Design a protein around this ligand. Structure first.
Ligand SMILES: [Mg+2]
Lengths: 252, 456
DNA sequence: TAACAGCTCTAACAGGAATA
RNA sequence: AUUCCUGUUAGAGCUGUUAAC
């Protein structure tokens, strides 16, 4: 058959928080205030937020806050198809819910999210499957290390996680990659990544994708729709449920 | 909940060779049967002419000798068959040039190359062909060798030596095969010999192979754009490449500019319908005046609604119009499970939505492997371990992905400039992009159409 | 018209050769 | 430029959503 890299997102609607402002706001202003304050919440302007009200109160003073109510995005797929802001917001919410209770590093290259293996926690028990998948001839490989001929460059096994709107469905796209710890120096690991990925053929890539799904969802894709949640200790939280098995099809 | 629609697999497109012999493997079928144009005499012989600096003419002589003599594959022996020489393979002599058909590039070429002025380098190179213009009956293809000393003028911002030369020599109706040090240097000699020999036969006559079981009542249009960076803004050069098997045995593969200026790749109503007015007239002239029964318009980007209106107004209700956008870079990628040793088979397509499909123009091909038959061949194995599908978006779709997928897949195997098994893109888009680069290099090519052999 | 977002493209390089 | 198309680096265009002018 054909196994894709798409995990269904069966969640259809998420509850959000609206903060009404006394003055007009720009998405650029919101995103720069995000960087300045560094809240434990996700914010978009359409002002929608996921997380706790106290963090939003840190971001906006009480003078510029009029009210804080609830938003109901009834059709998540249609809304993210209509709005790129909604697409980005829901993708970030699913990523935060995915990498919450797990040691996995969360990185961003360009505007793609990556779940990266931590160098400190490389030898963990949950990473043994990834070690086996990237190993050679049945031994145990490595999922973090130093680039062979590089002065300071480091590498780890990562998975790019994307949100994809296809028809009326939402998909989590997983692409196994090699994350380079200095982002702007990733070009210096071109040959290293090429040699590492060279023989990751259909079998090895299937094993790697299975290992990454197991890492990201605690379970293999058999009869599973594990429910992840971002900000479980907050008034406005998003609870997504993702099928653990990637999308697949048998031919006719 | 994760089960998508059932996928399908388009069989590997058979290639027509001499006397209607079908083989999926181009080089194997070519060696076994001979070119499709060997039944008749399109080339009675392949006469070459030499244009190279007087120090580098031994290189052209040597590569021509390697074309004459057999060569054994070294790299990619999974796929590449033994090369038996030009005469043996193509059933046509490879006539070495006489002294009058062997012209030296002037020292002004070297001077302007060291000056790093590709604009004058192309002018001087075409001027070196002045003697060959009068002798266009004597030779078929001119062999131009570009020494590495001219590397400074091969490519830089706003210039392309290859496209400029091929643009200057296109109205002169003399085909050219350019040889760099890459062909001389690449370690596998069967690779270079096969590629150069097929190119020389295609542009010294034509049709090394055709497509087996190809409908003659269809036209295939591909619109591809290039970008020319203005000092103030940008300019877009959209070109249209048509393929069709006409009533004549000569497979038709042409390109023509869609055109003053464009600020985006999207044609207007009176631009899209103007280029399609040119397109169906071109089809009609090769079909005794018959209208196409189906039009396949391939685009790199999406069709605007004005473009759809122009497309549907350029053709009568009898003609079935297929507007398809080709998305090369997609997030989806696939694994073959039964996990197979080799990746998803080439030709496998998975419908995503009503208007969206994933076509695997890259993948494992069966029955093409030379060593250990029964083992699939993944052509891009050195590049990637798994094939990346393309995405097909339908802007006028009655239903059924099989027709468009088969069309696109068959359209990946008739690039005679491509030495490998196939292409990830249809030749409509490939040649429209090549001609877009040519037109962006030289604006004064808009009026005429040009066959593939003048720019491949 | 100015940001923002996403999607998808070209342009310009570098780079190695098909299950090891 | 015998080829292939993979990465890297940028950009542009399309759409939107706001703020407008
Ligand atoms: Mg060529």
């Amino acid at each position: 058959a054909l196994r894709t890299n798409a995990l269904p997102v069966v969640t259809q609607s998420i509850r959000c928080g609206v903060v009404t402002l006394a003055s007009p706001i720009t998405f650029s202003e919101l995103k720069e205030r995000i960087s300045q304050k560094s809240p434990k919440a996700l914010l978009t302007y359409t002002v929608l937020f996921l997380g706790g009200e106290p963090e939003i109160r840190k971001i906006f003073s009480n003078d510029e806050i009029n009210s804080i109510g609830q938003y109901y995005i009834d059709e998540i797929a249609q809304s993210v198809a209509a709005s790129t802001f909604l697409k980005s917001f829901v993708e970030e919410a699913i990523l935060t819910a995915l990498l919450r209770e797990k040691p996995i590093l969360h990185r961003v290259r360009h505007r793609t999210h990556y779940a990266v293996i931590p160098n400190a926690s490389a030898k963990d028990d949950r990473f043994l499957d990834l070690r086996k998948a990237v190993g050679f001839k049945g031994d145990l490989g490595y999922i973090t290390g130093n680039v062979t001929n590089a002065k300071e460059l480091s590498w780890a096994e990562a998975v790019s996680i994307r949100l994809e709107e296809r028809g009326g469905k939402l998909w989590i796209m997983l692409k196994p990659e090699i994350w380079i710890k200095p982002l702007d120096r990733r070009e210096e690991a071109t040959d290293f990544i090429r040699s590492r990925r060279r023989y990751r053929f259909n079998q090895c890539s299937y094993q790697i994708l299975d290992a990454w799904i197991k890492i990201l969802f605690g379970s293999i894709g058999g009869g599973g729709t594990v429910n992840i949640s971002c900000f479980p200790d907050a008034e406005f939280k998003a609870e997504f449920e993702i099928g653990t098995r990637t999308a697949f099809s048998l031919g006719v | 909940l994760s089960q998508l629609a059932a996928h399908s697999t388009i069989p590997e497109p058979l290639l027509l060779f001499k006397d209607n012999r079908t083989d999926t493997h181009p080089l194997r079928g070519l060696s076994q049967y001979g070119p499709y144009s060997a039944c008749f005499n399109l080339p009675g012989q392949v006469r070459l002419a030499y244009l190279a600096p007087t120090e580098h003419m031994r290189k052209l002589d040597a590569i021509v000798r390697e074309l004459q003599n057999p060569a054994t594959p070294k790299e990619a022996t999974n796929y590449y068959v033994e090369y038996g020489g030009f005469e043996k393979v193509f059933k046509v002599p490879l006539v070495m040039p006489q002294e009058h058909l062997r012209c030296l590039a002037l020292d002004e070429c070297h001077g302007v190359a060291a000056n790093g002025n590709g604009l004058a380098l192309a002018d001087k190179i075409v001027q070196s062909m002045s003697g060959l213009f009068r002798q266009k009956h004597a030779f078929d293809v001119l062999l131009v060798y570009l020494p590495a000393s001219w590397k400074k003028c091969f490519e830089y911002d706003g210039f392309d030596l290859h496209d400029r030369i091929k643009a200057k020599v296109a109205p002169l109706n003399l085909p050219i095969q350019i040889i760099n040090d890459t062909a001389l240097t690449r370690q596998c000699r069967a690779n270079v010999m096969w590629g150069v020999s097929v190119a020389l036969y295609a542009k010294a006559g034509g049709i090394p192979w055709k497509l087996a079981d190809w409908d003659k009542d269809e036209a295939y249009i591909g619109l591809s754009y290039a970008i020319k960076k203005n000092a103030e803004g940008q300019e877009y050069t959209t070109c249209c490449s048509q393929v069709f098997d006409p009533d004549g045995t000569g497979f038709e593969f042409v390109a023509y500019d869609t055109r003053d200026r464009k600020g985006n790749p999207y044609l207007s109503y009176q631009e899209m319908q103007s280029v399609l007015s040119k397109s169906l007239h071109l089809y009609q002239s090769s079909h005794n005046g018959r209208m196409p029964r189906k039009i396949f318009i391939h685009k790199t980007t999406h069709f605007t609604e004005d473009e759809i209106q122009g497309a549907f107004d350029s053709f009568s209700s009898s003609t079935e119009i297929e507007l398809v956008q080709i998305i090369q870079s997609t997030n989806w990628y696939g694994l073959k499970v039964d996990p197979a040793s080799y990746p998803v088979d080439r030709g496998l397509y998975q419908p995503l939505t009503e208007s969206e499909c994933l076509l695997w123009t890259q993948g494992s091909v069966m029955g093409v492997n030379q060593q250990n038959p029964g083992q699939p061949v993944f052509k891009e194995a050195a590049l990637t371990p798994l094939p990346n599908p393309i995405m097909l978006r339908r802007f006028s779709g009655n239903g059924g992905w099989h027709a468009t997928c088969s069309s696109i897949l068959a359209l990946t195997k008739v690039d005679w400039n491509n030495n490998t098994l196939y292409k990830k893109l249809p030749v409509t888009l490939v040649y429209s992009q090549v001609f877009a680069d040519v037109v962006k290099q030289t604006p004064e090519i808009v009026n005429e159409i040009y066959d593939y052999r003048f720019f491949m």
